[PDB]
Amino acid sequence: MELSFGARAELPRIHPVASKLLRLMQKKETNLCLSADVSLARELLQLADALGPSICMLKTHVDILNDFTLDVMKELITLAKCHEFLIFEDRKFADIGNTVKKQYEGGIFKIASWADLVNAHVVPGSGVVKGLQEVGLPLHRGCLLIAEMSSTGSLATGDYTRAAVRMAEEHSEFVVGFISGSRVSMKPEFLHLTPGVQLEAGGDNLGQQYNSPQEVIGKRGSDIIIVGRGIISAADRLEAAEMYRKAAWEAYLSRLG
Amino acid sequence: MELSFGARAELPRIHPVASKLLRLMQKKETNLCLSADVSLARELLQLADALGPSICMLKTHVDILNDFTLDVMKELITLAKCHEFLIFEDRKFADIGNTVKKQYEGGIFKIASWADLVNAHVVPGSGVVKGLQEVGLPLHRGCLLIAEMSSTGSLATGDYTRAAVRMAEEHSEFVVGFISGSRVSMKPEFLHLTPGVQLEAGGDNLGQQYNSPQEVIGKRGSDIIIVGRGIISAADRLEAAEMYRKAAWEAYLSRLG
Ligand SMILES: O=c1cc(O)n([C@@H]2O[C@H](COP(=O)(O)O)[C@@H](O)[C@H]2O)c(=O)[nH]1
Ligand SMILES: O=c1cc(O)n([C@@H]2O[C@H](COP(=O)(O)O)[C@@H](O)[C@H]2O)c(=O)[nH]1
């Protein structure tokens, strides 16, 4: 009863952004999201161009880009369209609804104008989603809810994770899935994206913890791996991305049987 | 055994940023933080100048400022120095440590260069604080942890709130207090700042809930009220700020006896 990405793209209740994503994952044989955690626009764009064919999604932190402009993001959209990947701004909205709507639409980043996907913490209660969706529904955007975190001491466990799943499942006109370590919803209309991924065991010195693509996708049932330093600190980022793509894709196929 | 703000400023374990704040609160008879939730730099600066004498702190959301530049923030520092208030960027850092350090120091906002105080959600675990403090300790900054939220459905309750208090109390070289609805720590070295404040009962249509300064300061034991729309939507923002200042200050005095 587990469906391929291409069949999930057709589910009756699928969000159009999720459907677009699932179709390109199936087409390109990729369930890799690049975490493009760089500070230079040129590096961001060169990574997006070279790695675009290997990825289903490019995750940004626009607020670490020392030379952000909206024209950078126009360039990034051109590459996303060319290579067929979604743009996910990993802003982690986490305020009351009236504040996050402004943070999403406005200021100098105008996130909603260029990001297919954003994400939110569930700690404020469902007003965080209601505020975002007042901006994002008109613009045909989607949102991911942070149900679990990869870092040591995370409080996104137990009843908190359950609250995130309920909040999704109840805002499914806008919420398309989760940031999580594992499959947290049994409804196949929801995407699961998992950060904290490297091929080798380890972590960082600021609480990051790594698990492998086989563990995350194959054993824990997630859909997509989010990989930053495992790719971006490598010398050859293209070959690193291909290693991660092949790992995540085979883990998905093997789970699917 | 409850101490005045001026005596708390002298406590052995007080953080220098908390001490500076407590001294100016005592001097100016203000425990009001203006939530300057505007999109124009000119309005931000005109509010800071006119209301500066009435406030202990000005809370920003730099990411909704349509015409942000670092020169705006230089102007804002000049006013903070003139009128004696701290600048609190309400960024709600909420990522792994390695990410938040970059978000705090870098990008176009360079938050650490101008904000006396920032805040963080505790959901990622203590690496969020460790990452921020790698930037903020050298720059002699402070941080507030979000222990409770004002909005409907908040998950910052129970064991989550307790985890926030522990995390503070254990990073007290950098963490100076809390965003909370009430006094959550019994240690008087920690500040309690409470949003969701208006004189009249009510809320908004996106989950905000209001309580009065007398309730928050006088009954719930908080130190500082954070007020946005109750001031900024009023016609005369100066008189509105004075009403809130007088309310919060008298509630503090009456609690102190
Ligand atoms: O639980 C979570 C949620 C995240 O978004 N992230 C993000 O995913 C990326 C992980 O990067 P890296 O692979 O270099 O550790 C970072 O951008 C981080 O902000 C995470 O690491 N853990
Ligand atoms: O629990 C919390 C935490 C906050 O920082 N805030 C912030 O405090 C301010 C409240 O503004 P207002 O008084 O207009 O409702 C907003 O900037 C909001 O982001 C809040 O309302 N509740």
Side-chain angles (χ1 to χ4, degrees):
Chain A
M1 118 194 161
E2 178 123 58
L3 294 172
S4 70
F5 295 138
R8 290 169 64 193
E10 302 197 331
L11 283 161
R13 293 179 62 85
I14 204 66
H15 190 282
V17 170
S19 183
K20 181 175 183 177
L21 177 63
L22 287 159
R23 287 194 331 267
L24 67 84
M25 290 162 73
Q26 191 68 58
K27 177 180 179 181
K28 295 170 67 177
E29 300 183 340
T30 180
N31 57 332
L32 170 62
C33 177
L34 175 65
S35 190
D37 290 331
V38 300
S39 62
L40 290 177
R42 179 169 293 282
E43 189 175 24
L44 171 63
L45 295 172
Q46 288 180 167
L47 285 167
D49 193 20
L51 279 57
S54 300
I55 68 185
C56 68
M57 189 181 299
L58 190 149
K59 186 179 76 61
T60 57
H61 285 297
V62 69
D63 63 333
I64 77 171
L65 197 61
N66 288 333
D67 52 4
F68 176 86
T69 72
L70 282 165
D71 284 346
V72 174
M73 314 315 292
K74 184 207 78 250
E75 296 180 79
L76 188 63
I77 294 166
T78 294
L79 294 172
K81 291 179 175 178
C82 178
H83 298 304
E84 300 192 80
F85 59 81
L86 297 193
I87 300 166
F88 168 21
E89 166 55 33
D90 184 17
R91 172 64 180 80
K92 303 193 167 59
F93 294 105
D95 216 319
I96 71 172
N98 192 253
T99 293
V100 300
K101 71 188 193 336
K102 304 172 176 277
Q103 293 176 314
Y104 184 28
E105 194 177 32
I108 56 176
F109 296 134
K110 300 185 184 270
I111 292 167
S113 73
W114 53 264
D116 298 280
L117 292 168
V118 293
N119 61 350
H121 282 296
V122 297
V123 65
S126 64
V128 71
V129 179
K130 300 178 187 313
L132 291 174
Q133 81 184 8
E134 286 199 350
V135 174
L137 288 172
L139 288 169
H140 294 59
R141 303 311 194 183
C143 191
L144 300 161
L145 299 184
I146 301 159
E148 299 177 323
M149 293 193 70
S150 60
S151 42
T152 299
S154 171
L155 303 175
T157 62
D159 291 345
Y160 185 107
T161 303
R162 284 184 280 275
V165 172
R166 171 165 136 260
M167 190 180 297
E169 291 178 351
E170 294 182 351
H171 294 84
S172 67
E173 68 201 305
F174 184 53
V175 176
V176 304
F178 305 96
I179 309 307
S180 59
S182 60
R183 179 180 309 199
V184 292
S185 171
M186 288 302 117
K187 297 180 180 292
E189 296 81 15
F190 293 91
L191 291 145
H192 294 99
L193 288 70
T194 299
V197 174
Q198 282 204 9
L199 299 186
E200 300 285 10
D204 77 9
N205 292 326
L206 289 173
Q208 180 64 302
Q209 305 181 101
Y210 294 121
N211 288 95
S212 71
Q214 185 182 85
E215 172 67 24
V216 159
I217 302 301
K219 308 295 197 307
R220 300 180 181 192
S222 192
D223 300 316
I224 289 161
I225 58 169
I226 295 168
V227 181
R229 283 165 287 182
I231 294 165
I232 67 175
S233 298
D236 178 353
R237 278 83 79 92
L238 176 54
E239 180 61 17
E242 282 291 295
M243 292 170 79
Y244 281 99
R245 179 188 68 79
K246 292 170 185 178
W249 188 257
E250 174 61 20
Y252 152 75
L253 291 178
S254 286
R255 176 181 101 213
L256 201 61
Chain B
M1 118 194 161
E2 178 123 58
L3 294 172
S4 70
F5 295 138
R8 290 169 64 193
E10 302 197 331
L11 283 161
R13 293 179 62 85
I14 204 66
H15 190 282
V17 170
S19 183
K20 181 175 183 177
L21 177 63
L22 287 159
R23 287 194 331 267
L24 67 84
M25 290 162 73
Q26 191 68 58
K27 177 180 179 181
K28 295 170 67 177
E29 300 183 340
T30 180
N31 57 332
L32 170 62
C33 177
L34 175 65
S35 190
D37 290 331
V38 300
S39 62
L40 290 177
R42 179 169 293 282
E43 189 175 24
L44 171 63
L45 295 172
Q46 288 180 167
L47 285 167
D49 193 20
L51 279 57
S54 300
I55 68 185
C56 68
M57 189 181 299
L58 190 149
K59 186 179 76 61
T60 57
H61 285 297
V62 69
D63 63 333
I64 77 171
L65 197 61
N66 288 333
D67 52 4
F68 176 86
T69 72
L70 282 165
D71 284 346
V72 174
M73 314 315 292
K74 184 207 78 250
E75 296 180 79
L76 188 63
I77 294 166
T78 294
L79 294 172
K81 291 179 175 178
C82 178
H83 298 304
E84 300 192 80
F85 59 81
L86 297 193
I87 300 166
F88 168 21
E89 166 55 33
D90 184 17
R91 172 64 180 80
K92 303 193 167 59
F93 294 105
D95 216 319
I96 71 172
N98 192 253
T99 293
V100 300
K101 71 188 193 336
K102 304 172 176 277
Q103 293 176 314
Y104 184 28
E105 194 177 32
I108 56 176
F109 296 134
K110 300 185 184 270
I111 292 167
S113 73
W114 53 264
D116 298 280
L117 292 168
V118 293
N119 61 350
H121 282 296
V122 297
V123 65
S126 64
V128 71
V129 179
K130 300 178 187 313
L132 291 174
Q133 81 184 8
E134 286 199 350
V135 174
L137 288 172
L139 288 169
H140 294 59
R141 303 311 194 183
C143 191
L144 300 161
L145 299 184
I146 301 159
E148 299 177 323
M149 293 193 70
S150 60
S151 42
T152 299
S154 171
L155 303 175
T157 62
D159 291 345
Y160 185 107
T161 303
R162 284 184 280 275
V165 172
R166 171 165 136 260
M167 190 180 297
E169 291 178 351
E170 294 182 351
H171 294 84
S172 67
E173 68 201 305
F174 184 53
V175 176
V176 304
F178 305 96
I179 309 307
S180 59
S182 60
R183 179 180 309 199
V184 292
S185 171
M186 288 302 117
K187 297 180 180 292
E189 296 81 15
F190 293 91
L191 291 145
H192 294 99
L193 288 70
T194 299
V197 174
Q198 282 204 9
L199 299 186
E200 300 285 10
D204 77 9
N205 292 326
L206 289 173
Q208 180 64 302
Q209 305 181 101
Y210 294 121
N211 288 95
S212 71
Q214 185 182 85
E215 172 67 24
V216 159
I217 302 301
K219 308 295 197 307
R220 300 180 181 192
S222 192
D223 300 316
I224 289 161
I225 58 169
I226 295 168
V227 181
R229 283 165 287 182
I231 294 165
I232 67 175
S233 298
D236 178 353
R237 278 83 79 92
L238 176 54
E239 180 61 17
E242 282 291 295
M243 292 170 79
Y244 281 99
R245 179 188 68 79
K246 292 170 185 178
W249 188 257
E250 174 61 20
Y252 152 75
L253 291 178
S254 286
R255 176 181 101 213
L256 201 61

